[PDB]
Symmetry: C2
């Protein structure tokens, strides 16, 4: 389901792990520095994400954390279908870029990451009244409720 | 702005702090166990929240964490207006605790149970049939406000 498909992947900065989720159909993202690239941390991130948006399918790579039994259980509980097997790469790249631009503006990396996410989701680039990723996701989900 | 107003407050369970945010106009909530009831943890939660939804005004009580300079800076950066000072946030904490109680056994840790509870609350429909869920009301409210 186009409105319920997300892609997850981990990227790294300053020796830290950043878990990233992208709503494919809109470009909206959610990211967060996790203490360790474990299935436990990944499962925790997934539950929060699923309680927020209609997460039906998550696409990830071969990563141990994503293939873990704990993430599997989280997905079954949340009714999320998994697929291990474009977009997420671009996001990690651009997220790192924005993080770079605002890095000085905050003490810890985790804060910079959230500033970057905010900037990315609020960012526009269409006409004088196009749409931001944040606006596209709610529009997509709203129109799908009817 | 009705669509941009949120209320935040902390509640407690098992000796832990649970930070809770409620989108007043829809009943949609976001909660999370934080290591400590500090301005730092509160500011972190607020940034995440603001990058997700159109947070324009946050209403909280007199709490040190909410009045802290670090939260103040977060709000200025995020362009969020603060107000210090109803029944809504109280009801949510109460019901969240209720749902947490119902699913407490399905999770290894409280923090997980909290997220299960949030998921259940936001997905819940009155009477379990038709109608709108809090999750659907918030996106509808925000969507109709974009036009
Ligand atoms: Mg990977
Ligand atoms: Mg309190």
């Amino acid at each position: 389901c186009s409105p319920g498909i997300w892609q997850l992947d981990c990227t790294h900065l300053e020796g830290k792990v950043i878990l990233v989720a992208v709503h494919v159909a809109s470009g909206y993202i959610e990211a967060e520095v996790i203490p360790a690239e474990t299935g436990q941390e990944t499962a925790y991130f997934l539950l929060k994400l699923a309680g927020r948006w209609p997460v039906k399918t998550v696409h990830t790579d071969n990563g141990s954390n994503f293939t873990s039994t704990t993430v599997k259980a989280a997905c079954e509980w949340g009714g999320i279908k998994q697929e291990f097997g474009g977009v997420i790469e671009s996001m990690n790249k651009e997220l790192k870029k924005i993080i770079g631009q605002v890095r000085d503006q905050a003490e810890h990396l985790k804060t910079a990451v959230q500033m970057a996410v905010f900037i990315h989701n609020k960012k526009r680039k269409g006409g004088i009244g196009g749409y931001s990723a944040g606006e596209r996701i709610v529009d997509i989900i709203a129109t799908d409720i009817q």
